[PDB]
Symmetry: C3
Subunit: 214 residues, 3 copies
């Protein structure tokens, strides 16, 4: 990792103005492909999660969430270890984008986002809510470890990941569940899906979601 | 690094997609290469498909380029100037209507002058094309955006027609105009090619390409 | 990238998509890596899925590769020969019918000889596969295109069946064959796998991949 840029803002500043896949050079000297959104809200956003069509299975294990998974062309999770390494230094603001089946867009912004390391179960450290038409459904999850079906760290007598078919910084269980089970419409919706409580509520999911940092 | 798409094709890159070019300033430039059409080696510098990207942008935005490699984009006037400094690049314009019929226009050469000359279009002869000629009018004219009026109208054509182009008063083509998903949704001024479907009768997909 | 998709995955490349491999000669080769299927690390060298790309192509086109990163392609015979000069590459064939049913075929090893040997297929033993074995017949045979007949037939298999393959007289598999959008539009010879749906009963989606 022969130098490279440290984030999407730096790529943009350097003249990379089209959104798409770029390599960042991580602090440890490892190259990482990432999707940079160079257009929304001034550009320079590192998109680390995307839901679009239900083509990719998000009901995955600790190791899968740790390393990342999915398809560049469609849906993915960048990986918790990548996110921890990226967010160690610098202030990264979080933007969440949501789109319902009508094509109505809503959003949520948070001042900072950081994940602790694997020993701390990639615990979420979330900054304060700034603004968002979708409302705040992630603050509850701040301070909580990540749990998957094979790594129960939540505050429930059960395994929330198993219970609600996802992976997240579950409590018992959630106000948000963006790595939840995909549904192509309300009819096909699951009890627990790609939900944002303060927007459309539990059991009433979104068609497209993105989570992004700048 | 490679300086264009034909160079890339010659070295064995035979699949159409995104590649990196090396600009004179030692800058890496992502570009879309069409490695198939008419033998291949075409740098696609503008694409419209779905209305997902806003094309009503400022001088600075058009100078730098904007958009999404996954969908619609404008490569950027400065990028285009630097690319076309040398060589004679042929221009191919591809249009697709709402029924899916494709038509085209071919111009012998395409070059943009520098920013001091307002990215003036230098265009060779229309050679052939089922879409007919709707760019010759614009040859020799500076680029105009809503915040930088260089056209031949007392008003600002970019504002009147909601786009950016080498406007006169105002246009025979307007490929950076406002997107419309169907006819029914058509704007008075849209993604238009006057010799093709005419002003006010837009296309669903457009590509502008150099080779 | 390193030598194959497994090595990329092992270095942290966990998202499926287009990566670069560095070939023996020192040429960078864009390839698609599937980082998920059966643990991931598969290099996909052929993909069919729409019919948007013409697969009835010449010897030199099959040598160099052709298609679109976003959709259908053939990686190229010379590329495959270079990749398989070293290492052990298992072949996985993925087939999908018009109902979404997915079947597979696995072979222990896969290698292509050089051009002087007409990119002859060197195929290992069929291990398992719900689609059954329809490539074993083709092992040890030269590749054939409409402009280069090397098959075991008095005719040109590539012309008769409209594709390109390691034809005998003619085939039990024809995955580079003419696309069909339905079972109703099916051709005498199409994208066929004898032991699967059989000759004349084509698939909607196909991938050929190595690990
Ligand atoms: O029993 C699980 C439940 O946990 C709640 O806190 C959450 O609001 C619901 O979405 C549901 O997941
Ligand atoms: Ca628990
Ligand atoms: Ca004016
Ligand atoms: Ca013969």
């Amino acid at each position: 990792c022969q130098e490279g840029p440290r984030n999407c803002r730096e790529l943009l500043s350097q003249g990379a103005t089209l959104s798409g896949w770029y390599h960042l050079c991580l602090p440890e000297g490892r190259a990482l492909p990432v999707f940079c959104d160079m257009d929304t809200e001034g550009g320079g956003w590192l998109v680390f999660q995307r839901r679009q069509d239900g083509s990719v299975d998000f009901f995955r294990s600790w190791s899968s969430y740790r390393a990342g998974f999915g398809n560049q062309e469609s849906e993915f999770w960048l990986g918790n270890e990548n996110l921890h390494q990226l967010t160690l230094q610098g202030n990264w603001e979080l933007r969440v984008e949501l789109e319902d089946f009508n094509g109505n867009r809503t959003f949520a912004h948070y001042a900072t986002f950081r994940l602790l390391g694997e020993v701390d179960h990639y615990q979420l450290a979330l900054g304060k809510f700034s603004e968002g038409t979708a409302g705040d459904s992630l603050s509850l999850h701040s301070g909580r470890p990540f749990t998957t079906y094979d790594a129960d760290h939540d505050s429930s007598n059960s395994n929330c990941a198993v219970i609600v078919h996802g992976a997240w910084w579950y409590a018992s269980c959630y106000r948000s569940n963006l790595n939840g089970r995909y549904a192509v419409s309300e009819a096909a919706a699951h009890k627990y899906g790609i939900d944002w409580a303060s927007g459309r509520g539990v059991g009433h999911p979104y068609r497209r979601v993105r989570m992004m940092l700048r």
